A paper describes a structure:
Altogether CD38 appears to be a key player in the biosynthesis of calcium messengers which are involved in a wide range of cellular functions. Thus, the catalytic transformation of NAD+ involves the formation, via a ribooxocarbenium ion-like transition state, of a unique reaction intermediate that partitions between several competing pathways such as an irreversible hydrolytic process leading to ADP-ribose and a reversible minor pathway that governs the formation of cADPR. The L-shaped structure of bCD38 consists of two distinct domains separated by a cleft and connected by a hinge region. α-Helices are found mainly in the N-terminal and membrane-proximal domain of this transmembrane protein, whereas β-sheets are preponderant in the distal C-terminal domain. The active site of bCD38 consists in a funnel-shaped cavity with a fairly rigid structure; it buries the NMN+ moiety of the substrate and its scissile bond in its deepest non-polar and least solvent accessible region, whereas the AMP moiety interacts with its more solvent-exposed region, at the entrance of the catalytic cleft.
The active site of bCD38 consists in the largest solvent accessible cavity detected at the surface of the protein. A cluster of three strictly conserved phenylalanine residues (Phe117, Phe188 and Phe214) acts as a hydrophobic ‘plug’, sealing the bottom of this pocket. In the unliganded state, Glu218 is also stabilized by water molecules, e.g. two molecules bridge via hydrogen bonds its Oε1 and Oε2 atoms with the backbone amide group of Trp118. Several other water molecules are present in this region of the active site of apo wt bCD38; four of them are in line and hydrogen bonded to the backbone of the first β-strand of bCD38 C-ter domain between residues Val116 and Lys120. This cluster of water molecules could provide a means of access for bulk water to the bottom of the active site. In apo bCD38, the residues of the ‘signature motif’, despite being solvent-exposed, have also a limited conformational flexibility. This is mainly due to the occurrence of an extensive hydrogen bond system that also involves water molecules.
Residue numbers in the entry: 36 to 276
């Protein structure tokens, strides 16, 4: 645990820079071409500039101001999908219904599933290791990116929003998740949130709308003046149907 290899987390996604420029081209040309052209070279440059050659445990939200202003994670009213511990299911649901998760916005699509960090006084990505959230530091560029992006995504929500939660976990709602700490607490009043608790096929559900973790969610939303409807006791096929 010295030099570039000093961190406890996996190193940066190998080939990160090429991956994000490839993804930007796919997004802007093939998947969700926009009203005006975007320059993917410039977006990639802004992404790199946010974190390259800096202390990987001193990341702040402000470091991403330029990048986020370039491509705010905006979704039409009524079409946003939040999710927690249901990644595969939530994205299948959104695809079928023509809705948008955070990973369907430009920046979310770029970064989905990747890791990155730099090193002070170096222009290269650190492929040896990167800060682990728990074992090294929470103020790292990967963690901070998702916090900032998710907050903008939440603030942006209007009309009815849906959250896909895991009915096969003890607690479907985790107050310390990004959804619980950053997204739910930043929904605007008059938003209406519908929560779906979906359990594994062939298995009995483990948490429900009347359980303790959902009471915590209900309390957040009450504070924000957000109407809440909770649906549970269903599996993947019924949910997707
Ligand atoms: C609820 O969460 C569980 C546990 O994370 C999910 O089951 C995991 O699914 C992944 C990918 O399919 C597998 O790699 C793991 O083996 C699974 N773990 C367990 C404990 O089964 C499950 O898919 C989630 N359920 C829903 C409906 O989203």
């Amino acid at each position: 645990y010295s030099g570039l290899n000093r961190w406890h987390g996996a190193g940066s996604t190998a080939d990160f820079q090429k991956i994000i420029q490839e993804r930007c081209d796919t997004y802007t040309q093939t998947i969700r071409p926009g009203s005006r052209s975007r320059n993917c070279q410039a977006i990639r440059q802004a992404f790199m500039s946010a974190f390259i050659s800096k202390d990987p445990c001193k990341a702040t939200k402000e470091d991403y101001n330029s990048l986020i202003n370039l491509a705010p994670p905006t979704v039409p009213c009524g079409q946003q999908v939040f999710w927690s511990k249901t990644k595969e299911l939530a994205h299948e649901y959104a695809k079928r219904r023509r809705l948008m998760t955070l990973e369907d916005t430009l920046l979310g699509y770029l970064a989905d599933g990747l890791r990155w960090c730099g090193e002070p006084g170096s222009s290269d990505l650190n492929i040896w290791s990167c800060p682990d959230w728990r074992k090294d530091c929470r103020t790292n560029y990967l963690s901070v990116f998702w916090e900032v992006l998710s907050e903008r995504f939440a603030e942006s929500a209007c009309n009815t929003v849906r959250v896909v939660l895991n009915g096969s976990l003890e607690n479907a709602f985790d107050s310390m998740s990004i959804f619980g700490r950053v997204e739910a607490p930043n929904l605007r009043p008059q938003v209406e949130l519908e929560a779906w608790l979906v359990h594994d096929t062939g298995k009995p559900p483990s948490d429900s709308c009347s359980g303790s973790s959902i009471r915590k969610l209900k309390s957040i939303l009450d504070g924000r003046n957000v109407k809440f409807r909770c649906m549970d006791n269903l599996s993947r096929d019924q949910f997707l149907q």
